[PDB]
Amino acid sequence: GGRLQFFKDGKFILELARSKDGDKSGWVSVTRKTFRPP
Amino acid sequence: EEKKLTRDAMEKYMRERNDMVIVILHAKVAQKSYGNEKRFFCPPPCIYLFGSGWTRRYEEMLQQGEGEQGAQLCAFIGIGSSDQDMQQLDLNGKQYCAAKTLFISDSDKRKHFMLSVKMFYGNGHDIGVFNSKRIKVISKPSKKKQSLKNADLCIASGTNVALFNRLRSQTVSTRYLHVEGGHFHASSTQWGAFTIHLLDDNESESEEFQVRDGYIHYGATVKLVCSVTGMALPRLIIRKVDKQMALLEADDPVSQLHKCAFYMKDTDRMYLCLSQEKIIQFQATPCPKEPNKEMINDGACWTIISTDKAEYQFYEGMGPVASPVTPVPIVNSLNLNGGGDVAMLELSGDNFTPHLQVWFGDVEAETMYRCTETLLCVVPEISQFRGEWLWVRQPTQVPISLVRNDGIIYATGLTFTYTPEP
Amino acid sequence: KIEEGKLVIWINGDKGYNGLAEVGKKFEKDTGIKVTVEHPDKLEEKFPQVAATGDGPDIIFWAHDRFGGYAQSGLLAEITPAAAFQDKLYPFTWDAVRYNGKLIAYPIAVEALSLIYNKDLLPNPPKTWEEIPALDKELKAKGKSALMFNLQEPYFTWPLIAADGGYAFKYAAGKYDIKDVGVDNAGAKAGLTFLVDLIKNKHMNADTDYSIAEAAFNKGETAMTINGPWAWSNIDTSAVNYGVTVLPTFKGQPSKPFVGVLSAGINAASPNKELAKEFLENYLLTDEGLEAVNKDKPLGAVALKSYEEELAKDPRIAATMENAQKGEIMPNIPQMSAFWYAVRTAVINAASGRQTVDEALKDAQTNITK
Ligand SMILES: OC[C@H]1O[C@H](O[C@H]2[C@H](O)[C@@H](O)[C@@H](O[C@H]3[C@H](O)[C@@H](O)[C@@H](O[C@H]4[C@H](O)[C@@H](O)[C@@H](O)O[C@@H]4CO)O[C@@H]3CO)O[C@@H]2CO)[C@H](O)[C@@H](O)[C@@H]1O
């Protein structure tokens, strides 16, 4: 899958990844270095 | 004849990127003029022009038969109230111009204001009105410990400052810390904006130095770095100045328009000092009466002030337009907007109108106007960039533009990459 | 943005677009509706970029592999032909344009690559890829080469890569498994190694593209080429006496071309959907409409049963279908372009020496599934 990374004056500000199987795509925000306990 | 931007016109723009750039460098605070005495803004607000587009437009107008006077750039600067009493800037054919006679009288009761730069050609063709960032009106700094009276009066690590020295009974009144040709100077015509970095007390001398946050206090080890060249001075100790003496005991926060001295860390009482346009080290004499006080030269007393910058970029994608290019839309942040059936990209900023479209490179996106501070867009098809994976050396930083119905392209400082999921 | 009361069509530059424009002129004479046929470069990438903002053509032509990606983004109008019209085309061609249970385009023609050879330079073309180095040495001594074909597009090199075991997506449990890619297995590596060895030994050049290979074959400088039915017209007008035959085998196994079905989709943003349907069903998909296109650039084995039967005796079409039977009809799933982009770079990087065969394919394997 591909990932979108946005930069404001060369500084990383946002990352988007594609939405899962259900149902269409679609973009979701992502924090790859953050674990959220359930 | 108002014309929409074509993909061909965007492709042409993306080849050279010759955006018209206007920079306004200024102080974040301004001291008031009580009575009749005018206290001119110091350092003087500076207007910079960048890009080959300015000279190109001038030559196009001369070949169109506008004449020298018609082709000339006209620039005026004001305080915004009273609106009528703007001052001319001699900006024509120049890289920059400083506004040396700006003031705010005691009759003006505004707590804050912005500088306004009005630009047009001699033939009457309007460019627009470009604002500085918000400037706070302040009273003269007092001899009191700054107990965080305003986060605005304090100076945070990682923020920019100007440093100047006022000369008494001299033909040159004021000198500013400035970098040129890899050297620090005490210039009479130019001033630099220096990033002031807070360092740990045990941090050694080096160029690739540490990261520390918080407000700058007296007695702190600081690094002054040129925001344009990256040139730095060696480690300094920012110290409070009283009369003509440095106060070692001072631990209070550094405030706007405070007179301060910079002790060269790990030297024998050497202080950052001017001698004409030169920057030197000058040795302080210890006070015989007071133990924690050192007598410094007049050239070693620097006034500190926080600075800011306003930057505007525009491009006539479909050639000259009948309407001003201002207010220039500004994008401060991006977020994904969940509220609604389809997850849209949200652009937060200022000066948005229903006449703006978001473009991802040369691809126009479906744009929804919400209010003057918010635009939403559907991320367009960008999977063609998978054609570049393992072909380009580094992922392409694709520019995001705001395009007006008349073809004006506004560069936003925003870029995106499209890369494989890790 | 798309203009109502007119039709704009996009079709690739290698297809019979002048023949299609003749069908458009007949449509205009009978209906008063002007038909504009365009062949923009990268039309298959531009279509999802412009159709998402209400722009683009009313009708888009491309092989069926691109269409599932367009349908997933809501860019195509659903195709609902009457039973009597649907029965006029081969069921397997409708299967190529069926996505998530819906017909998303009209099938036009079936295409497959074949080996094309110059009968005067080479009366007995090689049955195997393995005998091409010795043949090239023999032809080089007379100032000729054995084989020239497009090395820039993975469509042309895929039959060899697939021969010993390479595959795009594994089909399992009623669907294509987008996580099971077959571009870095032993079979794919053997096929690409053989191709890179041909370049290393100077039997082929890494820079050979479509126009270079076509000019060389059509001028009689190379004994063989690899191409599809669309290329036959330009050979007909040359002085070359050519044959169209089975692709060479590799490691005793047939070359497996990915079979394309040229298809016509209707833009979901079009205000002329009924005019587009009338043009496609009543004008194009007729013996007369397909003949006008086929006379310009051969279509291959057309989807229309009556016209396919008429042309079936052409030995060049019989060779196309012999090669097609040895390969498989491409998936139409959205990930197909991801597979093609990754394989394109792997072949170019391995052919140029930028990556080894193993590293190029291992990286393509990851990216095709990413
Ligand atoms: O920068 C990378 C290149 O990107 C673009 O090319 C991509 C296409 O967008 C993808 O769709 C794919 O192309 C496939 C094509 O979808 C598939 O049908 C087949 O194409 C055959 C076609 O069926 C046949 O009728 C005839 O026209 O020959 C075509 C092949 O030349 O195979 C294609 C892949 O080889 O992948 C390609 C990249 O490989 C863009 O158009 C390029 O300009 C760009 O360089």
Numbering used by the authors:
A (entry chain B): 232 to 269
B (entry chain F): 101 to 522
C (entry chain A): 1 to 370
Published text:
Transcription of Notch target genes is regulated by the transcription factor CSL (for CBF1/RBP-J in mammals, Su(H) in Drosophila, and Lag-1 in Caenorhabditis elegans). CSL functions as both a transcriptional activator and repressor by forming complexes with coactivator and corepressor proteins, respectively. The structure of CSL consists of three domains: NTD (N-terminal domain), BTD (β-trefoil domain), and CTD (C-terminal domain). In this case, Su(H) binds the antagonist Hairless, which in turn interacts with the corepressors Groucho and CtBP (C-terminal binding protein) to repress transcription.
Here, we determine the 2.14 Å X-ray structure of the Su(H)-Hairless repressor complex bound to DNA. To determine the Su(H)-Hairless-DNA crystal structure, we purified recombinant Su(H) (98–523) and Hairless (232–269) proteins from bacteria and stoichiometrically formed a complex with a 15-mer duplex DNA, containing a single Su(H) binding site. We took two approaches to improve the diffraction properties of our complex crystals: (1) we introduced surface entropy reduction (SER) mutations into our Su(H) construct (R155T and N281G); and (2), we employed a fixed-arm carrier approach, in which Hairless (232–269) was purified as a maltose binding protein (MBP) fusion protein (MBP-H). Subsequently, we were able to isolate Su(H)/MBP-H/DNA crystals that diffract to 2.14 Å at a synchrotron source and belong to the space group C2. Hairless wedges itself between the two β-sheets that compose the Ig fold of the CTD, significantly distorting the overall fold of this domain. Strikingly, Hairless wedges itself between the first and last strands of the β-sandwich, making extensive interactions with the hydrophobic core of the CTD and burying ~900 Å2 in surface area. However, the region between β-strands e and f undergoes the largest structural change upon Hairless binding, resulting in a completely new conformation of this loop, as well as displacement of the terminal β-strand by as much as 4.5 Å. Previously, we showed that the region of Hairless that binds Su(H) is a random coil in solution; however, Hairless assumes an extended β-hairpin conformation when bound to the CTD of Su(H). In particular, F237 is buried the deepest, anchoring the interaction between Hairless and Su(H). Clearly, the binding sites for Hairless and NICD partially overlap, and the conformational changes induced in CTD by Hairless binding would sterically block interactions with ANK and MAM.
